[PDB]
Design a protein around this ligand. Structure first.
Ligand code: ATP
Ligand code: MG
Ligand code: MG
Ligand code: MG
Length: 448
């Protein structure tokens, strides 16, 4: 069945055998790249290798990179807690080939692990390849010997990965595990591995030119595949995250399997706990802008659902220990940051807790008040009060109102923001005008 810490260890040890020097996951905080707030894949730290800038001693490298999908174009923070497959923090596993082997090797080493290493029968496996990429279809169907009906040839939106507007990109291939007949869609056909084939380098005009030395990039979700092997139907039910859920059950008294708006918060605490744990360990302090404000948002949204559960006291600080204990094997580093990070998560809570509550009474007050006078949204002078007078993240104010079906007049919040940038300026983060709303959801009032 393999445990979480067993699958990760089987992955890295397996490819090491395939000539892949095991590398240590870089910190969630990008070293020399101010734009990319948080890492998001195993090829992030090696982005300068595929480019040809760096020349690591090894032509091959495997790693379990710590990822955080809460910024830029890959922002999942919204669906976190609403589904069973979306996390902020998550462990990505993968192999990378720096102009070494290619598709014929990337697949072989990818099929042996899934069948000869994960003990998943080859009768329920499924794969995908870029239709116009007969190169991969041959290896799969002909070489490896897989039936055609079990292979899908999709378009660009499904089988063509790119490293931005310009740079190395190319066709891809995904490995899907069939979960029976009781399920439907991407569930029954859970994506478990993403094999990316850097073949072409898109120029500034959108034209694709081949590379003289192709590359390989793979990203298998640890928690996601762990679900399969652990016969679970939720990434939140794995040996490493469930204890965190029950931790919520115990802090509130509530249990799993009853209401929808309850299982959510439970997943919210457990997930966000992982986020705010490794984050602070990798050098992030709750501030009012950029990275430092992403942790604060994640830590404040946990604070909210916790309060929605009835937990009227700082609790996440107790959850930091559980994480270190569950994650001290692959990342012993956390132990040293345990007490450290424990003081931080406890420091933030006792700071905003009193405000977080007062605010919940304010916001909810203008909710029923609004829907009575027939308003379908919250006024700009209302979401702002909660943003300033209460330090509530603008995204949170939105989620708190979205419950009753109410929205928030964007333009109002827009004008209201100008009514303060002109007021404060008449009677760090710099933001344009009319572009205030494209930054007000990522920076606090005190920093905006
Ligand atoms: N938030 C997440 N929580 C859990 N697993 C994830 C998450 N994001 C990605 N994964 C897993 O990591 C694998 C590699 O990431 P990839 O970039 O292919 O994801 P994706 O294209 O966003 O697909 P998906 O829609 O299933 O998240 C995915 O196939 C999936 O198994
Ligand atoms: Mg996705
Ligand atoms: Mg996909
Ligand atoms: Mg994918």
């Amino acid at each position: 069945s393999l445990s979480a810490h067993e699958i990760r260890e089987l992955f890295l040890s397996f490819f090491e055998k395939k000539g892949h020097t095991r590398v240590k996951s870089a910190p969630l905080v990008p070293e020399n790249d101010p734009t990319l707030l948080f890492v998001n894949a195993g090829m992030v730290p090696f982005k300068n290798v595929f480019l040809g800038l760096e020349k690591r001693p090894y032509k091959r490298a495997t790693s379990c990179q710590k990822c955080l999908r809460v910024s830029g174009k890959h922002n999942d923070l919204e669906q976190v807690g609403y589904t069973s497959r979306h996390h902020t923090f998550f462990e990505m596993l993968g192999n990378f080939s720096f102009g070494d082997y290619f598709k014929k090797e990337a697949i072989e080493y990818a099929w042996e692990f899934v069948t000869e290493v994960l003990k998943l029968p080859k009768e329920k496996l499924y794969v995908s390849v870029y239709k116009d990429d007969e190169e991969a279809y041959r290896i799969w169907n002909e070489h490896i010997g897989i039936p055609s009906e079990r292979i899908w040839r999709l378009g660009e939106e499904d089988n063509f990965w790119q490293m931005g507007d310009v740079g190395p990109c190319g066709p891809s291939s995904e490995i899907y595990v069939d979960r029976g007949e009781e399920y439907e869609g991407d569930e029954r056909y859970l994506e478990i591995w993403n094999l990316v084939f850097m073949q072409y380098n898109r120029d500034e005009n959108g034209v694709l030119t081949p590379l003289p030395h192709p590359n390989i990039d793979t990203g298998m979700g640890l928690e996601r595949i762990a679900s399969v092997l652990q016969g679970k139907n939720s990434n939140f039910e794995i040996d490493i995250i469930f204890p965190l859920i029950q931790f919520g059950e115990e802090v509130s008294g509530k249990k799993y399997g009853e209401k929808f708006e309850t299982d959510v918060a439970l997943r919210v605490i457990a997930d966000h706990l992982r986020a705010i744990t490794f984050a602070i360990s990798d050098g992030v302090i709750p501030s009012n802008e950029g990275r430092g404000y992403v942790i604060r948002r994640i830590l404040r949204r946990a604070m909210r659902f916790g309060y929605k559960l009835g937990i009227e006291n700082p609790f996440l600080y107790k959850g930091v220990d559980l994480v270190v204990d569950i994650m001290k094997e692959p990342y012993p580093e956390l132990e040293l940051s345990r007490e450290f990070v424990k003081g931080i998560v406890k420091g933030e809570e006792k700071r905003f807790i009193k405000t977080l509550k007062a605010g919940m009474e304010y916001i909810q007050e203008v909710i029923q008040k609004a829907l009575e006078e027939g308003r379908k949204t919250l006024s700009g002078k209302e979401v702002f009060t909660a943003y300033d007078t209460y330090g509530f993240p603008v995204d949170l104010i939105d989620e708190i109102a979205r419950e009753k079906g109410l929205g928030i007049d964007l333009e109002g919040f827009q004008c209201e923001l100008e009514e303060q940038r002109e007021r404060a300026r008449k009677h760090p983060v710099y933001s344009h005008l009319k572009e205030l709303g494209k930054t007000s959801a990522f920076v606090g009032a005190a920093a905006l």
